[PDB]
Amino acid sequence: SKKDFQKAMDSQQFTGPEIQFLLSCSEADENEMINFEEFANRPARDIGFNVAVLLTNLSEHVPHDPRLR
Amino acid sequence: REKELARKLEFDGLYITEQPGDDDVKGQWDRLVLNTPSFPSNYWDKFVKRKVLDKHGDIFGRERIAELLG
What we know:
- This is part of a larger assembly, with two copies of chain A.
- Chain A has three helices and no strands.
- Chain A is an all-alpha fold.
- At the A-B interface, loops of A face loops of B.
- The PDB classes it as transport protein/isomerase.
- Keywords: channel, membrane protein, TRANSPORT PROTEIN-ISOMERASE complex.
- The entry is titled "Structure of RyR1 in a closed state (C4 conformer)".
């Protein structure tokens, strides 16, 4: 249940507004309950790969620029 | 052997995460003692066991960890 997932998310700590965003971003399937496996699509990972690559590429190429850090 | 453990719960935290595995049960005896109230008797840090729950257990069942400790 979405409220039970909202309670589960209080600990295991993602920020709370973001928690409510997970609730909305889930599915709200079958009145108030949610699958885990469906809620894993985002595939999306390549972007974040390339982002981390980018930021590492910067922290390597452009060190000690504290805002970037 | 306490210190080998006492840090290991508070860093690798394996009992909280891993288990030692079938070999080196000398490390798997440890599963016993860690439950003991008087465990860190020699490392001069009795509050390790308290310190550990501050970590790790917030990630999951902080007193689900307590059954492992007390």
